[PDB]
Scaffold this active site. Sequence first.
Site, PDB file in Angstrom:
ATOM      1  N   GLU A  99      -5.454  -8.591   0.596  1.00 54.99           N
ATOM      2  CA  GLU A  99      -6.071  -8.213   1.850  1.00 54.99           C
ATOM      3  C   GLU A  99      -7.541  -7.944   1.583  1.00 54.99           C
ATOM      4  O   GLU A  99      -7.900  -7.320   0.587  1.00 54.99           O
ATOM      5  CB  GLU A  99      -5.501  -6.924   2.451  1.00 54.99           C
ATOM      6  CG  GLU A  99      -4.036  -7.055   2.928  1.00 54.99           C
ATOM      7  CD  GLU A  99      -3.536  -5.820   3.673  1.00 54.99           C
ATOM      8  OE1 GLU A  99      -4.366  -5.003   4.099  1.00 54.99           O
ATOM      9  OE2 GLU A  99      -2.302  -5.677   3.839  1.00 54.99           O
ATOM     10  N   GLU A 131       0.815  -1.218   0.000  1.00 50.87           N
ATOM     11  CA  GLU A 131       0.000   0.000   0.000  1.00 50.87           C
ATOM     12  C   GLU A 131       0.856   1.279   0.000  1.00 50.87           C
ATOM     13  O   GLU A 131       0.719   2.151   0.898  1.00 50.87           O
ATOM     14  CB  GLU A 131      -0.939   0.005   1.209  1.00 50.87           C
ATOM     15  CG  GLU A 131      -1.812  -1.222   1.297  1.00 50.87           C
ATOM     16  CD  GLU A 131      -2.919  -1.149   2.348  1.00 50.87           C
ATOM     17  OE1 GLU A 131      -2.826  -0.256   3.238  1.00 50.87           O
ATOM     18  OE2 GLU A 131      -3.877  -1.959   2.266  1.00 50.87           O
TER      19      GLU A 131
END
Length: 465
Positions: free
Chosen positions: A367, A194
Site C-alpha cells: 500500500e 496492518e
Amino acid sequence: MFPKSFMFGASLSGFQFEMGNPNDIKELDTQTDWFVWVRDLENLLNGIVSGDLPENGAWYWRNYEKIHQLAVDFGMDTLRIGIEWSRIFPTSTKEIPFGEGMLEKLDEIANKEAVEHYRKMMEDMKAKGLKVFVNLNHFTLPLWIHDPFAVRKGKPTDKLGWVSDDTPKEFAKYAEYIAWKFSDIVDYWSSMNEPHVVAQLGYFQIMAGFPPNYFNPEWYIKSLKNQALAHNLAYDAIKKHTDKPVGVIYSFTWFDTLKPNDEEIFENAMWLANWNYMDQVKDKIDYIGVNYYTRSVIDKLPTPVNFKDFELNWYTVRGYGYACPEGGFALSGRPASEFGWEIYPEGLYYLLKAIYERYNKPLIVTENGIADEKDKYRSQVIISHLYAVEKAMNEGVDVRGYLHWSIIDNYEWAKGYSKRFGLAYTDLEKKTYIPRPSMYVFREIARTRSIDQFKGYDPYNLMKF
Ligand SMILES: [Co+2]
Ligand SMILES: [Co+2]
C-alpha cells in the site's frame, strides 16, 4: 527499468469495497464488528464515525469484472484483495477442533455461497491475466469473535476480539480452510493487514474511532501478540496446501526525531511501532508487505510512562507526518493530504533499507496512496515513492512490487467516503469508476516499467535524496 517480474497493481479490502446494494440480503454482511460500529448511536452523534454506511459503497461484490478490467486497462498485473472471515463463517467454528476431519466439518458449516462468489471473482481476475494476491483479514472480525459494544462498556463477554485467546485458534482454522479451497488459484497469501493498527487504535490511541475503543495498554500488547500467533499458525496451516508465498502486510512508520542526538527514542519508537510484532513472525514469512503512507516526528517525553509491557519515553510532534492540518502543509513545508498526512517519500526509502537489513526478506510495497479528491498531488506521490523504491533497489534491497492504495475511492473506516484514495473517482450514485489524470501516469509507468521519463520534473522537490 523495473524488472518485467516487478508487480504493478493495487490493493483492496472486503469491507471498504464489496457492498453497494443495501437491499441484497446475500451481499449485505451484517455480521462484523465494523458493520455494527458504524451505525452505533453514540458513535454517530459524537462524530466518532462519519455517518456514511458501507452498504452504500463501491459495489465490488457485483462490479468486480469492471474493476478487474479497469486494472488491466491501466497496466496492473496483480491485485491484492481481502476475504471477509465473517462471510465465509457467519456462525462460530469454536466447536470444531483441530485435527483429522476438521476441514470436512468446516466445509459443512461454511457459507458455500460466499465461498463460490469469491471463487468467481478470482477466476475473473485469472481470466483477465491478473495475479491473485489474497489477504485473509483486514480489520473487520465476525461478531461471534468480537462484540465491540460489550467490550467498549466493560461488560462480560467471551467475544473479546484479538484479546481473546480463542481468536488466533479460530483464525488458524479459517486460514487453513481457505488455503484448502483456493490453493489452485491464489498466487500470493497474506494472513492479515496492518495488525499494529488494529491493536493500537483499538486499545491505545482511542481517538481514531476504531473498536473496541477501550483504553487498555495491556490489551494493546496482548492483541498484537495474539495477532502474531494467529499469523504464525496461519502460515503453517496454509503451507499444508500450497507452496506459494505466504507473508503479512504491515503498516511501517518511519520516525524522525525533532532534535539531533535522540537515537534512543528513535530505536524505542521503531521497536514499538514496527519490530515488536515483526520480530514475532519473522520465522514464518516468505516476504514482507510494506504499507507506507508517511512518517512521524517524535520528541522526548519529560516524564516517561512505564506500562506492564513497555516504557513510553517519547511523544508525537504536531505538524509533521500523520499529524498535519488536513489539506494544508507540514511545518517542513511539504504538502499534506486531505487526511493531514505529510508527503514524505524518503521515509519509504529509509524503511525499505531498515526492514531489509533487519529481516533479509523480499519486500513488496503493498500500500501507498493519498487522500486527494482533486488529484492535486497523486501523480507526484506515485512517481516520488517509486523513486524511493528504485533507490532502495539500486542499493541491493529486494523489492518485488508496488500496489497502490487504491484503484478506486472506497469506505475509509471511521471517515467514511470523505477520504478519497482512488486512482479512479468512484461515483457512488451510478457505481461507476472514472480514472483520474494520475491513473494515466500510473499506466504509463507500468507499461514502460520506468519513471526515467518523469524524473526531471519535480515540482514539490520530492526526489532530492
Ligand atoms: Co455475480
Ligand atoms: Co525535523
